[PDB]
Each structure stands twice: as structure tokens, then as C-alpha cells.
Amino acid sequence: MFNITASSSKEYLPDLLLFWQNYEYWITNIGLYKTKQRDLTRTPANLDTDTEECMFWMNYLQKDQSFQLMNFAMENLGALYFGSIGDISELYLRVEQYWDRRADKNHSVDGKYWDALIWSVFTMCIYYMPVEKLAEIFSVYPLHEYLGSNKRLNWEDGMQLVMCQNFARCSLFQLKQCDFMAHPDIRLVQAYLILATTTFPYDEPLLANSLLTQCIHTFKNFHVDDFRPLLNDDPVESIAKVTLGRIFYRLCGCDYLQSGPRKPIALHTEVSSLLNSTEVLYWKIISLDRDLDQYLNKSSKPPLKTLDAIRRELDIFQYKVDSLEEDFRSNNSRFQKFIALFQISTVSWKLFKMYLIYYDTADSLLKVIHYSKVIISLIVNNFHAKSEFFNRHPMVMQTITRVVSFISFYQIFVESAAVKQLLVDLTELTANLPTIFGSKLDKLVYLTERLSKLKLLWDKVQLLDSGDSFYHPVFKILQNDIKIIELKNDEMFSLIKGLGSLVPLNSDFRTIVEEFQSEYNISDILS
Amino acid sequence: SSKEYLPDLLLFWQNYEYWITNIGLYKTKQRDLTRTPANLDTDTEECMFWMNYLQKDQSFQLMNFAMENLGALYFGSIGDISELYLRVEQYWDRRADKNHSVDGKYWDALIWSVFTMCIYYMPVEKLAEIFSVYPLHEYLGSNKRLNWEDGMQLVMCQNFARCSLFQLKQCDFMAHPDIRLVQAYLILATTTFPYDEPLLANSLLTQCIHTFKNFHVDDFRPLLNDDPVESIAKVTLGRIFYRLCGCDYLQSGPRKPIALHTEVSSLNVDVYREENSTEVLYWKIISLDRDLDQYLNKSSKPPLKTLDAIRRELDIFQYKVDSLEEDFRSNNSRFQKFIALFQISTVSWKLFKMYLIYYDTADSLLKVIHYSKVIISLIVNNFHAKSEFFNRHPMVMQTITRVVSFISFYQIFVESAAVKQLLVDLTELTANLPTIFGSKLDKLVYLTERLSKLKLLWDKVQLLDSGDSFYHPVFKILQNDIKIIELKNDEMFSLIKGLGSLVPLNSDFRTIVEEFQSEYNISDILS
């Protein structure tokens, strides 16, 4: 993080912001969300614990509660399922059928595919339902009678997450009853694109990467090289190709949002680049976000003309997002406009962060603070309109993680009063994100607290130099925070454990570094 | 004054071979979804019987048979089997426990795949001395007098493969990727498991590609700064990689889009000629087959410089396989000799077939007949003692399919005297292949019978000239077989039947064509 006595020069800051463009990836992208440190000698797995578990969680949800869940999804979630399953009014028939042939003894594979699709839809309903509507529909007491936890808790203190995860596991178990590897079909892709609108790709990242590899395998199985409605074909096949276009957009979106080192097989490589009509808007914004965030792990800094072309396209899509009309009584269009405006604000914030880091253009920190205040004014606004479930979509965890980590990292080194007020606003917002995120929210609070204590360590310890190289304990601690997680995401040790009997055989500066790493360890954000 | 249609009919054979004998016969599984069952009570009481049917000493006799007679198959994947006797010991120790770690269940799945390979490659005389016929028939409820050689060893092979898959599915192997999945599939790929389930094997192979590329290892050369355990780890990983490319190319088609094999052995590419020729010699002889079978579906002639280069590498690998060690005191050396000699005979036959079709060089028909006699002389030679099971490897089924289909196709249109005796010899050989191939052998016999009846139809109807192009019922039947199997290998119809309520909607010669397609249909080779 740098490129003997003390000094006061500022050669540390330009190489240090380029070091932020590596730290952001390996901590807030890969280490916090996409790293699940597993152990195979300690993990239990069978088919006696989970079978009766899925029996209980399917016998728990009664018939008429499911239709209230589907009515909530139809009225209040229109910007999520339309990318995957189109119209949910076509899916009421499948819920009626599943509550007809539930009593049968022999289920067909097509029937269990429709059951897995509607249970993934039920998982999306549970994840986005407010606690007021969720306490009216479901009861709490049989879940405590079966699981055996402390019976005093409500839904909001860590119980809606457990029912969401168990409904996602029931959807996956009904996929596993299909032997879906032996019968590839589009309901697998639709069910995973419903499940990926929740925190399923962060509670089980390796399982979601294998599900996404199966979805890429099942989608490329059909061999559609053009998603345009041609005049010569059957008008049923043209509707099918429109459906595969709008599923392919969401599928490359979820392909980008899991772009870790634990997901090596890509779908988005077969798409061009920019360098109905509202789902393609999310596609353009996510593709622009990909064209920005591909410069994290690589070392080649982007050109000025590239960022300027991204800026012109960003202004065009800002005009497109600001022109989407919406009815305040129709909650689906409000959530639609929230998703579009929040994604375009996230792309704007990342663009001006890359301006601040890679070139330090004059009057660019003001734009970073401006779009951070735009993100805050979007998220805090949802508490004042009784649409509190808008802040549960997984982009407001990713975006707030990037923003609070960058503002903490900038308040460590370069002090400013506006940045300090912005950091206080970020901390107050991070404390008030919804409880459905669960462990990831508490680990974000831990990471912000660790970068706050690192500012105290930067203040009470004086910077050194070596003429061209600068030494400081904060620099070495931020080196080792990347090195620990690059050691954790090194799958060579699982390979050595898998190949058999091969067992792996492996001043105050160092004192302060080891005491700070013992006190605030970076491996507390792992799971 | 000769037969002028023949060049543009052999150029049609280059397409008929791919859409019948490659894709239509081995890699097509026409499944409906409103008829296929899906349950976890049928298999959980069936695989329990197939895991209780084997005993301890029977399993150690299977492992002794593997250690003495199958070293050309597992040693690339799992290494030497003397490290795996401990795993069979630990499986029979941990049989009665009720909490299984995933690191135990992967070794259980790997040794059940090894047991599947042992059952598939065992002669019936050694099989009857180990197992018992009667408890299996008292369980399954079938024809009682149905001894192992009459079509029962295939049933126990398929059920041991399915029990190895059930123990993989108890691992939650999508949520815990490890190299033992890749090893278990590379053991199962030496059987007819990639042809009994050609859509399950493609998805398991996609999971093995995702499991391999999870490690992010591109250079298998052990670097100077490596752990001395990690060096042997990367060497074993390189052997697994080239075994995986070998078993990955053989399943290429329209139902398997995600391919691992990306390199070239002649003339970008990533990963080749960095590795020592030990058992990448099995890969190098298949990439030299990939450079010939990439012009089946392609509609351009291979350049003759490429065919001369392939001929030169054929001569080099002839002298390399004759440079192998003569360990006659181990019976697996003759089987490795048979594999690496039958592959080079197969690639020689395909090379001179493409010389005969595309260019008609010096005596290329006689070279096709000569290498067909070399393939016959390699298979008939194995009908002696102690090496009868060598004709069970799936490459002889693939190669005998290609060769007898080309000779039956060429006997129709060219009245020759050596091709006729060669066809009688291959008919006698196909009626003497091992019965463990099952239904694929009967479908190959049916395809040869259909081409012989089509020869009888060729002499019957007089050829209708039209000046610029010819017309005959045989030509239209051969045109329509590809169109029927391309209609069967198009998953768009299952997509229209899958997206919801969508419904799929779209003389002298025609009578003879429809009578021949009604009497000898091409849809019999699918099942």
C-alpha cells in the first residue's frame, strides 16, 4: 500500500487509493459475501435430517396462506418476478394444482418442477414481506414447538430469516426430488432467478454458484443465438424467444452479481458490450456496473476516454430512469422506480469513485459525497412511506457495504468535515438496515468499526519513510487483510485434503500489527 | 461412364455419421416430463438393498480385481489403488454410524464408483465365483432363470452406478465441491454410464468442470517455490485434468454446451505441451481425433496439410506406443497397450475415411479397409483367455459403430468385393461383441440391418437422373433420418411445453419412402 525517519509527504495517497481498488474487491466483494470457509471432516450431511424437515416446512404452510403470499407478490413485487417468470397471474393455476395433487403418492417431474418454482416464489414472498403482514398470516408457536428455540422472540428478531432460508431449502429439496441434473428444463432457471432476488446467493454462495452453473448449462442447452421475434416462426415460438430474452437478461445479471473466484464458468462472455422495455434498462445499468467493476482485480488502470464514455451513457440512462412514470397507489411501479434509481445511483457513485481514485480529477470528491447522499436519501425515504420492504433487496447491502467501506477508508487518511458528517450518516444508516440481512449486516457493522479503530491507530502512530517507500503499521495491516482472505479463498488445501493421505505440512511495528490483528481479526467477517 | 453422385454422397456421409451414430444413437434421451416419476421413497429403499447386497470380502475381491486387471483406467483418476484399500476399510468400519461427515461420504461415493467399474469390467466366470444370482432375483421380481451372462451384470452395474450417485447426492455435492467428485465421475465414465444416462452424465460433467476450474490451476508444472506436497498435488491434478478432457470430448454434442477441452495438438489455446507424456498420451490421441471429428457438423473440407500433419503424428504415436514398457507380469500393461493401440487404429481409420471422402487420394479405400481389418484384428485377438473383457471399453462400441455404419453405407452404393467380405466380417464381429453394452448393441445391429435393407432398396428402384442432380428414394430416406433426429435433439419443443400454457404447433418415390420409414423407422435407435 505504498510506492529511516519520519516524513509528511503524500506519495502514500495515490498508490493507497489504487490499493483501495484491490481491498474493495478482496474484502467487500469476495471475502464478506462470496467466501464460505468450509470444512469437510466437520460438516454433517445425510438424507434423514432434512427429509422430515422439508415435510414439516411444507405441512406448516397451509393452503389459504399461500394465496395471500401470492397476492402480496402480485401486488407488491412486480419488478422481480417479471424478469424470471413473467406474469404471476398465470401461476395461480399452478398453486391450485399443487394444492390439489399434494395428497397423491406419485408425482411427475413436471409437477415437481412447478412445485419447486412456486416454493421459490414463496421464499421470495417471505423474504420481502413486512413484519406487520407476516405476523397476520403466519403463526409463531409451531416453529418453536419443532425447532426448540426461545419462545419469546417475534418475527423481526431473527425469525423471518430462518423461515426464508428453510423455504429456500424446501425449494431446493423439491428440485432435488426431480433429479434435475437428469431432466434439464427452464423451470430450474426460473426458480433460481426467483431465489437470487433474496439473500440466497450469500447464505450459500458455493451452492448458488453450482446452481448458476446448472442454470447456464440448462440455458445454453436450448441453443438460442438470437432473441429477436422473427416474422417467419410460429407466434408461440416468438413469445418463447421473448421469454428467453428476458430470462437471459436476468441470468447474466445474476451471473455478474456472483463473479467471484468460486464461480469460474461465465455466461456473460457470449454477450456484446455498450463500449419489455424496463427489464432491458436494468440490464444496461448492470452491464455498465460490470464495465466499471471489472477494473478492481486487474492492475491496468482505465483510460479517461473510457470513463468519459461511461459518463455520457450514465447521463443518458439517468435521463431514462428519471422519466419512468409511476402511480403512487400501484406499489409495483414504485418498487420498479426504486430499483432503477438505486442501481443508476450506485453506478454513478462507482464511476465518480473511479474518478477520485484513478485520476483525482478536480471537483470529484464533491460528486462522490453527492451520490452517497443520494443513496442515503433513497434508503431513508423508504422508512417514511410504509414501504419498508424496499430496503431488503440485496443491492442495498452491496451498495451500502461499498459506500461505508470507502467513506471509512477515506476518513482514515484524508480528513474533511463533510466526509465526517457523511460517515456519521452511513453509520446511522447501517445501524438501521433491516434485520432480514442477519449476519451480513452485523459483519458490515464490524468492518466499519474495524476501519474506525484503524483511524485511531493511524492517528496515534506516526508515519515513517524510506525516501520513496513509506512504512506504517496501518499499511501492513491492510496488506495482511487481503493476504488472509486470499489464503482463505485458495482452494489448494481442499485439493490436498481431497487427494488422499496427503496432509499439508504448513520493534513496536510488528508488535502493534500483531496486537491489532489479535484484537480485531479480519477473519470475523467470514462464515 | 461411372457413378457420379458418389462424392457428394460421401460428403453427406460426413453429416449422417454425426447425426446418427454420434448424436442420435449414444447421446439422445427423449424424455417426457408428464410421465417420468420423481420420488425419494423408491430409490431410498432400492439403493439401500444394493448397498446391503455387497459384503466385505466381495468388495475386497472387486478391489483385488481392480488392482490386478484395470490399471489403465483408474490410475489416471484416483492414482494407485493401494492408498484406497484404507478407504474400503474405513467404509466397512463406518457402515453402522448415523452421523456421516462429507469427507467420509465422498470416499464412499468414490469407492462405489470403483465398484461400478469393477462390475462392468469383470468377466462372467469371475463374477459367478464372487456374487450370487438368487437373492437378486428374489428381490427384483423378474424372470428367475436370467443368469449373469444373459443380461443381468448390466443391471447390477447400473444400480451400483446409481448408488454411487445417491451417495454423491447425500454429500450436497453442489454445496461442497471437491476433487473426489471429479475422480468418481472419471471412474464412472469408463462404463456405459455416459450412455445409459446421456443427460445426467452431461450435468455431472458440467459439475466436474465447475469443480475443476474452482481450483484456478492452469499450469500443472510444479514451480520452484512450491510446497513439496503441493507439487505432487498439482501433478495428480494434471493427470485428472487430461483424463477429464478425454472423458469430456467424448460427450460433446448439442446437449452439452460447456466444454473444458481448449487446446490444439497440431499447427488461442491455453494449456498444452507443458506436461510430460505419461498418460496424457491418451489425451494426445483424442485431440488428434478431435481435429478429424470437428469436420462432421462443419460444412467445409479439412485442408490437406492438416491431414498430412495428423498422419505424421499418427506415425509418431505408433512409435511412442511401441516404446512403452513390456510389464507382462502385470495384466494391466496389455490393457493399456490395447487402449493406446485401439485409439490410434481408430484415428487412422477416421483419417483415411476423410481422405476417401474429401479428396480421394492414393488407395484410400484400401487404407480404410486395412485399418478396418486392424480394428477387427485388435478386437478378435481379445477373444482369448485372460483378456476377454478388453472389448468392453466404450471406445470399441463407438469405433465399431462408426466402422460398421460406414461399411454398411458404402456397400449400398459401391459394388465391391473386398468391402463385401469386410462387411460380413464386421457383422460376425458385431454379433460377437460383449453383451454388457446392452441395448446399444441391439440398436447397432438394427442400424446395420436397416442399411442392408436400404441396399436392397437401392438395387430395386432405378435411379432417376435429372441432369444437374439425381433423385432416388434411398437419398430421401437418408435425408429424412437426419431431419427426424434433429427434430428429436431440439429442446425447443420441451421449452414450449415447459414455459406454461404454450402449445407447439409447428408420387412414385414418396410411397416407397413412407413404407420404408413405417417398416424400418429410424426412431428405434433412440429409446
Add this chain to the structure above:
Amino acid sequence: SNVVLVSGEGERFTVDKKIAERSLLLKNYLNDEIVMPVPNVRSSVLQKVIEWAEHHRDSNFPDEDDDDSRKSAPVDSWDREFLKVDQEMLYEIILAANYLNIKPLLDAGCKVVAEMIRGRSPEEIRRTFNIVNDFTPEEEAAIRRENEWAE
């Protein structure tokens, strides 16, 4: 021991094994009395091929992948005093060496055809002008009119 090269007419030519492993095809065929058919070769042509191998048992030939040692090698004195035969039987020797994959017989037996294509009289290049068609008669008239002025 000994192998048998069955010709295309039906005769049997017992050849020593180390001599008959000059043919790459037979040396690869031996990896199974070992007879083998040679279908398109007459008995006299196969006799000439076997006499060539009987002489060149002990000789040492280039590495079959050369630019200099394979193109610019002169023919032997025996190879030039060996191929003074009928032209059609010379091409049949070359066909026999291209079947049996005997590369140095296809080397020295085919530089003779190269020495016969070049080194020929320029009168009978003018005589052999369109023995194969290769030109429209309008272009033949134009070509003969362009060099009409000399002769």
C-alpha cells in the same frame, strides 16, 4: 522371424522381419506367421520393392521431416541404376511405396520423376501445350498469337 507380404495377384513373398520393418505400415501392423494383404500391387512391383529394402537394410535415411536433407539429397547410384524401368511401372513402384508408407523409396523413387519433368526439351513443352485442356480455345488462340512472331 519372417513375415509374408501377400501381393495383389495372390503370391506370397517371405521377407525378413528387420528388412520388412522398413515399411512403416507393416511395422505398425506387427503390434498385434504374420501375413498381410497388399491389394493394389502386382507381384513384380512388390518384388522390386522388396529388392530395394534388401539393399537398403543397412543404409541410413533422413528423418522424414527435413527441408535440406530430404529435398536436396541426391539419389544413390543403385537407386538410379535400379529405376531404369518402364514409366508406368515406375509410377506403380511409387504407388506401392505410398501404400506401404515406405518413405525413402518414395524419396529416391520420386526424385527420378522430378529429374524427368525438369531437364526435358523445350520443343516438346511447345508440343505438349494443351494435352490436358486447361484453356479455352480463344485463350489458346491468344497465347499462340502472342508468341507467333518468334516461331
